[PDB]
Design a protein around this motif. Structure first.
Motif, PDB file in Angstrom:
ATOM      1  N   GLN A  74       0.795  -1.038  -0.074  1.00 41.25           N
ATOM      2  CA  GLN A  74      -0.039  -0.180  -0.129  1.00 41.25           C
ATOM      3  C   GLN A  74       0.908   1.303  -0.090  1.00 41.25           C
ATOM      4  O   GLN A  74       0.497   2.292  -0.708  1.00 41.25           O
ATOM      5  CB  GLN A  74      -0.890  -0.068   1.247  1.00 41.25           C
ATOM      6  N   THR A  75       2.032   1.287   0.742  1.00 42.72           N
ATOM      7  CA  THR A  75       2.570   2.566   0.958  1.00 42.72           C
ATOM      8  C   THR A  75       3.432   2.899  -0.494  1.00 42.72           C
ATOM      9  O   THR A  75       3.390   4.129  -0.701  1.00 42.72           O
ATOM     10  CB  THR A  75       3.983   2.185   1.879  1.00 42.72           C
ATOM     11  N   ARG A  76       3.736   1.699  -1.261  1.00 44.49           N
ATOM     12  CA  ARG A  76       4.488   2.037  -2.452  1.00 44.49           C
ATOM     13  C   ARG A  76       3.297   2.625  -3.415  1.00 44.49           C
ATOM     14  O   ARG A  76       3.373   3.684  -4.239  1.00 44.49           O
ATOM     15  CB  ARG A  76       4.902   0.822  -2.932  1.00 44.49           C
ATOM     16  N   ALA A  77       2.130   1.804  -3.538  1.00 40.02           N
ATOM     17  CA  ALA A  77       1.177   2.119  -4.490  1.00 40.02           C
ATOM     18  C   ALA A  77       0.561   3.813  -4.455  1.00 40.02           C
ATOM     19  O   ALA A  77       0.547   4.409  -5.334  1.00 40.02           O
ATOM     20  CB  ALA A  77      -0.014   1.213  -4.327  1.00 40.02           C
ATOM     21  N   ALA A  78       0.583   4.094  -3.041  1.00 41.78           N
ATOM     22  CA  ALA A  78       0.196   5.459  -2.840  1.00 41.78           C
ATOM     23  C   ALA A  78       1.108   6.439  -3.297  1.00 41.78           C
ATOM     24  O   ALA A  78       0.881   7.611  -3.778  1.00 41.78           O
ATOM     25  CB  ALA A  78      -0.332   5.778  -1.420  1.00 41.78           C
ATOM     26  N   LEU A  79       2.375   5.934  -3.253  1.00 39.06           N
ATOM     27  CA  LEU A  79       3.507   6.805  -3.679  1.00 39.06           C
ATOM     28  C   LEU A  79       3.620   6.900  -5.012  1.00 39.06           C
ATOM     29  O   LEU A  79       4.177   7.893  -5.579  1.00 39.06           O
ATOM     30  CB  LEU A  79       4.620   6.211  -2.922  1.00 39.06           C
ATOM     31  N   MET A  80       3.287   5.982  -5.824  1.00 38.79           N
ATOM     32  CA  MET A  80       3.223   5.845  -7.132  1.00 38.79           C
ATOM     33  C   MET A  80       1.991   6.537  -7.749  1.00 38.79           C
ATOM     34  O   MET A  80       2.395   7.179  -8.626  1.00 38.79           O
ATOM     35  CB  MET A  80       2.805   4.319  -7.701  1.00 38.79           C
ATOM     36  N   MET A  81       1.048   6.573  -7.287  1.00 45.91           N
ATOM     37  CA  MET A  81      -0.179   7.494  -7.779  1.00 45.91           C
ATOM     38  C   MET A  81      -0.162   8.862  -7.194  1.00 45.91           C
ATOM     39  O   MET A  81      -0.803   9.636  -7.820  1.00 45.91           O
ATOM     40  CB  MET A  81      -1.438   6.727  -7.183  1.00 45.91           C
ATOM     41  N   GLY A  82       0.644   8.993  -6.253  1.00 49.24           N
ATOM     42  CA  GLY A  82       0.809  10.518  -5.762  1.00 49.24           C
ATOM     43  C   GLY A  82      -0.246  10.839  -4.812  1.00 49.24           C
ATOM     44  O   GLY A  82      -0.632  11.987  -4.879  1.00 49.24           O
ATOM     45  N   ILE A  83      -1.034   9.882  -4.248  1.00 50.60           N
ATOM     46  CA  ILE A  83      -2.015  10.178  -3.223  1.00 50.60           C
ATOM     47  C   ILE A  83      -1.552   9.605  -1.996  1.00 50.60           C
ATOM     48  O   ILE A  83      -0.710   8.705  -1.861  1.00 50.60           O
ATOM     49  CB  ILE A  83      -3.441   9.402  -3.770  1.00 50.60           C
ATOM     50  N   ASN A  84      -2.117  10.068  -1.016  1.00 52.22           N
ATOM     51  CA  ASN A  84      -1.879   9.723   0.399  1.00 52.22           C
ATOM     52  C   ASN A  84      -1.918   8.196   0.434  1.00 52.22           C
ATOM     53  O   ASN A  84      -3.065   7.797   0.361  1.00 52.22           O
ATOM     54  CB  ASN A  84      -2.303  10.606   1.509  1.00 52.22           C
ATOM     55  N   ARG A  85      -1.367   7.693   1.105  1.00 52.20           N
ATOM     56  CA  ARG A  85      -1.976   6.234   1.613  1.00 52.20           C
ATOM     57  C   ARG A  85      -3.016   5.849   2.403  1.00 52.20           C
ATOM     58  O   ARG A  85      -3.609   4.790   2.211  1.00 52.20           O
ATOM     59  CB  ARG A  85      -0.619   5.673   2.474  1.00 52.20           C
ATOM     60  N   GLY A  86      -3.431   7.009   3.013  1.00 49.26           N
ATOM     61  CA  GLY A  86      -4.738   6.950   3.804  1.00 49.26           C
ATOM     62  C   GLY A  86      -6.030   6.941   2.781  1.00 49.26           C
ATOM     63  O   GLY A  86      -7.102   6.260   2.810  1.00 49.26           O
ATOM     64  N   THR A  87      -5.940   7.793   1.546  1.00 50.71           N
ATOM     65  CA  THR A  87      -6.900   8.097   0.661  1.00 50.71           C
ATOM     66  C   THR A  87      -6.703   6.575  -0.121  1.00 50.71           C
ATOM     67  O   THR A  87      -8.029   6.429  -0.900  1.00 50.71           O
ATOM     68  CB  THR A  87      -6.775   9.160  -0.037  1.00 50.71           C
ATOM     69  N   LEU A  88      -5.926   6.219  -0.427  1.00 49.08           N
ATOM     70  CA  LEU A  88      -5.471   4.763  -1.269  1.00 49.08           C
ATOM     71  C   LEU A  88      -6.436   3.770  -0.435  1.00 49.08           C
ATOM     72  O   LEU A  88      -7.439   3.140  -1.112  1.00 49.08           O
ATOM     73  CB  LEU A  88      -4.131   4.478  -1.418  1.00 49.08           C
ATOM     74  N   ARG A  89      -5.924   3.740   0.808  1.00 46.74           N
ATOM     75  CA  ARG A  89      -6.689   2.827   1.492  1.00 46.74           C
ATOM     76  C   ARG A  89      -8.311   2.898   1.459  1.00 46.74           C
ATOM     77  O   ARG A  89      -8.924   1.931   1.222  1.00 46.74           O
ATOM     78  CB  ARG A  89      -6.483   2.897   2.972  1.00 46.74           C
ATOM     79  N   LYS A  90      -8.733   4.283   1.560  1.00 41.66           N
ATOM     80  CA  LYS A  90     -10.093   4.567   1.269  1.00 41.66           C
ATOM     81  C   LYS A  90     -10.764   4.140   0.318  1.00 41.66           C
ATOM     82  O   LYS A  90     -11.954   3.477   0.374  1.00 41.66           O
ATOM     83  CB  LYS A  90     -10.447   6.176   1.813  1.00 41.66           C
ATOM     84  N   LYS A  91     -10.185   4.445  -0.854  1.00 38.21           N
ATOM     85  CA  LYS A  91     -10.511   3.881  -2.414  1.00 38.21           C
ATOM     86  C   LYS A  91     -10.759   2.401  -2.458  1.00 38.21           C
ATOM     87  O   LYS A  91     -11.555   1.863  -2.489  1.00 38.21           O
ATOM     88  CB  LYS A  91      -9.670   4.371  -3.342  1.00 38.21           C
ATOM     89  N   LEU A  92      -9.707   1.754  -1.746  1.00 41.37           N
ATOM     90  CA  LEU A  92      -9.689   0.338  -1.888  1.00 41.37           C
ATOM     91  C   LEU A  92     -10.737  -0.335  -1.201  1.00 41.37           C
ATOM     92  O   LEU A  92     -11.406  -1.297  -1.679  1.00 41.37           O
ATOM     93  CB  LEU A  92      -8.528  -0.233  -1.280  1.00 41.37           C
ATOM     94  N   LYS A  93     -11.150   0.093   0.122  1.00 47.60           N
ATOM     95  CA  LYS A  93     -12.444  -0.071   0.584  1.00 47.60           C
ATOM     96  C   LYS A  93     -13.769   0.042  -0.322  1.00 47.60           C
ATOM     97  O   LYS A  93     -14.393  -0.825  -0.497  1.00 47.60           O
ATOM     98  CB  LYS A  93     -12.687   0.844   2.062  1.00 47.60           C
ATOM     99  N   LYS A  94     -13.795   1.160  -0.883  1.00 46.88           N
ATOM    100  CA  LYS A  94     -14.921   1.890  -1.764  1.00 46.88           C
ATOM    101  C   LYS A  94     -15.268   0.585  -2.995  1.00 46.88           C
ATOM    102  O   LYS A  94     -16.135   0.395  -3.259  1.00 46.88           O
ATOM    103  CB  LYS A  94     -14.438   2.788  -2.267  1.00 46.88           C
ATOM    104  N   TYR A  95     -14.065  -0.187  -2.919  1.00 43.98           N
ATOM    105  CA  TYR A  95     -14.225  -1.120  -4.144  1.00 43.98           C
ATOM    106  C   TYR A  95     -14.081  -2.671  -3.856  1.00 43.98           C
ATOM    107  O   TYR A  95     -13.829  -3.383  -4.574  1.00 43.98           O
ATOM    108  CB  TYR A  95     -13.389  -0.722  -5.562  1.00 43.98           C
ATOM    109  N   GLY A  96     -14.181  -2.693  -2.378  1.00 39.20           N
ATOM    110  CA  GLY A  96     -13.915  -4.155  -1.904  1.00 39.20           C
ATOM    111  C   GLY A  96     -12.704  -4.568  -2.313  1.00 39.20           C
ATOM    112  O   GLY A  96     -12.559  -5.834  -2.855  1.00 39.20           O
ATOM    113  N   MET A  97     -11.835  -4.099  -2.107  1.00 40.55           N
ATOM    114  CA  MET A  97     -10.228  -4.465  -2.672  1.00 40.55           C
ATOM    115  C   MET A  97      -9.226  -4.432  -1.547  1.00 40.55           C
ATOM    116  O   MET A  97      -8.365  -3.596  -1.436  1.00 40.55           O
ATOM    117  CB  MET A  97      -9.743  -3.757  -3.626  1.00 40.55           C
ATOM    118  N   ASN A  98      -9.629  -5.649  -0.353  1.00 38.84           N
ATOM    119  CA  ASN A  98      -8.681  -5.854   0.614  1.00 38.84           C
ATOM    120  C   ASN A  98      -8.922  -7.031   1.480  1.00 38.84           C
ATOM    121  O   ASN A  98      -8.420  -8.006   1.555  1.00 38.84           O
ATOM    122  CB  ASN A  98      -8.720  -4.344   1.393  1.00 38.84           C
TER     123      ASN A  98
END
Lengths: 98, 91
Positions: A74-98
């Motif tokens: 997660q830490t890398r993915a959020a760093l790749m997309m230029g979004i904070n790790r927190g909002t990445l996590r949030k999006k992942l919830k939104k789409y049931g990806m966890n």
DNA sequence: AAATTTGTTGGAATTTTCAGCAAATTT
DNA sequence: AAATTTGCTGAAAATTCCAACAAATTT
């Protein structure tokens, strides 16, 4: 030197022209076509969600793909997309990806 | 079944729909492949940028330049729409 | 064993709403 | 002539960023 690669051609999808010749084209044009098509089917009631509709269609695969790349990190993915790790996590919830 | 889809054609000349997301996924599949471990710094703003421009362009055709209806259609505040049109300088 | 990533936080920064103008454009 | 839409505005409502932390995990 290096030849120019306009931003249209960074994300591209394979297509076929009238000569059965395979060729890349911008992702832009797929999104353009999908909407063109979407409007045809509007016969012809209103919409109030076209952004969140589109956004959701595009966010899912991006996350899907990035998480595969970062092998779940997660830490890398959020760093790749230029979004904070927190909002990445949030999006992942939104789409049931966890 | 599914609202956002694009036309494909197979070897046998049959046209057939597939969801847009499958193309977004391919786009990246490719994008990553070509990078040989090179940093990807701002991929979200990238893909966002590639999707908002067609979306804006297309609704502004459908709403016939009418900013107000487009915003209610897309479901974002009229001001945002203008602000985004500025981002890409379509005005 | 060490280095990193996770899950969670409370606050700060920034982005989007929202209603309300008058002025300009469409009907 | 009337109705609608624009360009603008503050300020509230929501979302995003932040950064710090113990605890779980990956190296």
């Amino acid at each position: 030197m290096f030849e120019q690669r306009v931003n249209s051609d960074v994300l591209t999808v394979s297509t076929v022209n009238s000569q059965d010749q395979v060729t890349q084209k911008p992702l832009r044009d797929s999104v353009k076509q999908a909407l063109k098509n979407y409007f045809a089917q509007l016969n012809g009631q209103d919409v109030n969600d076209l952004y969140e509709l589109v956004l959701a269609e595009v966010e899912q695969p991006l996350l899907d793909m990035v998480m595969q790349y970062t092998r779940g990190n997660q830490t890398r993915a959020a760093l790749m997309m230029g979004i904070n790790r927190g909002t990445l996590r949030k999006k992942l919830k939104k789409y049931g990806m966890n």
